[PDB]
């Protein structure tokens, strides 16, 4: 994983998401104790983005058929790259909490959004 053999967009997206998750992990204890109302606007926006991203990494697999009735789903690479770029840009923040849990594809995300 280095831009020498991989496109630079992959590297940039990975660095951005890692930084966001690291900052959220840092702010964890203050959020838990003093609450979200104490932080500034930037911290609140990063907290919301971190929640969105953390929920988005989940995905259902076919091997879960025995345990849960949800069928399998698979997504290619370019779609994931574009979706992560969109999420880190911050243009999907209007969606509720449950809309980003156990989502395979972007069209599935839109369909679940229209279902609430």
């Amino acid at each position: 994983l280095d831009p020498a053999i991989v496109g630079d967009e992959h590297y940039r997206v990975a660095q951005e998401v890692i930084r966001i998750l690291q900052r959220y992990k840092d702010l964890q204890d203050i959020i838990a104790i003093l609450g979200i109302d104490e932080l500034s606007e930037e911290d609140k926006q990063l907290v919301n983005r971190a929640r969105r991203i953390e929920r988005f990494l989940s995905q259902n697999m076919m091997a879960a058929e025995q345990f849960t009735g949800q069928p399998g789903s698979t997504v290619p690479l370019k779609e994931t790259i574009e979706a992560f770029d969109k999420l880190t840009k911050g243009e999907f923040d209007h969606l509720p909490e449950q809309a980003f849990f156990l989502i395979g594809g972007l069209d599935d995300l839109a369909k679940k959004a229209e279902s609430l």
């Binding site: 204890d29 203050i30 104790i33 003093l34």
Partner: protein, 49 residues
């Protein structure tokens, strides 16, 4: 255990820093509030007279 102790140490340090910053900010705001409050005396005295 060991990890829990380190976690609580880190949390307490962060809390101490945040509280110190908030205290200093409030002490700063005290002076501006005191400057603002004492500006309505002449109008009150004249209207009472």
């Amino acid at each position: 255990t060991l990890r829990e102790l380190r976690g609580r140490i880190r949390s307490a340090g962060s809390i101490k820093k945040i509280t110190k910053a908030q205290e200093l900010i409030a002490t700063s705001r005290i002076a501006k509030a005191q400057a603002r409050v004492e500006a309505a005396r002449p109008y009150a005295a004249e209207i009472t007279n």
